[PDB]
Amino acid sequence: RETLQAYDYLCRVDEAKKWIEECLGTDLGPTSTFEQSLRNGVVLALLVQKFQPDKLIKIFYSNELQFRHSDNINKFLDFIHGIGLPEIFHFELTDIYEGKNLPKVIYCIHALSYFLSMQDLAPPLIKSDENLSFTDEDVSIIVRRLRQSNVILPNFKAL
Ligand SMILES: [Br-]
Ligand SMILES: [Br-]
Ligand SMILES: [Br-]
Ligand SMILES: [Br-]
Ligand SMILES: [Br-]
Ligand SMILES: [Br-]
Ligand SMILES: [Br-]
Ligand SMILES: [Br-]
Ligand SMILES: [Br-]
Ligand SMILES: [Br-]
Ligand SMILES: [Br-]
Which CATH number does the domain 1-159 belong to among 3.30.565.10, 2.120.10.30, 1.10.418.10, 3.40.50.12780? Predict the structure, then answer.
């Protein structure tokens, strides 16, 4: 049951990654380290820029994850709120910056994809191939993370 839960969530992360890769037309590295790469808010802010082409979005760049990275995050939060994405799909700064609930970010990304794709404002998220696989090590890492984690995975299935 643990392995499967680990594998499924990795598929959810993979699907959100691919969707963003499609929107931005770029490669975003391994799925196993994708959640952590969003903590600086750059990718998410770049998403705002795409959907707000007439606005000049300010993005803080730095290898070191610091408080000013919050501004990058807030751009994305102001955006999903501005376009009317239901609040139940939103996440808080602490969930991503301090990384207390990264799965909620992935969840937010899926909901946004549907909100936009249903309106033909962006491409639709693509369900993971049935034979998509990850290394046993990557799966175990997620198993370990969920054991020490006291957060409940979001309801992707009800989307
Ligand atoms: Br499995
Ligand atoms: Br799932
Ligand atoms: Br773009
Ligand atoms: Br455009
Ligand atoms: Br801005
Ligand atoms: Br609402
Ligand atoms: Br919606
Ligand atoms: Br598009
Ligand atoms: Br851990
Ligand atoms: Br977690
Ligand atoms: Br699902």
Answer: 1.10.418.10
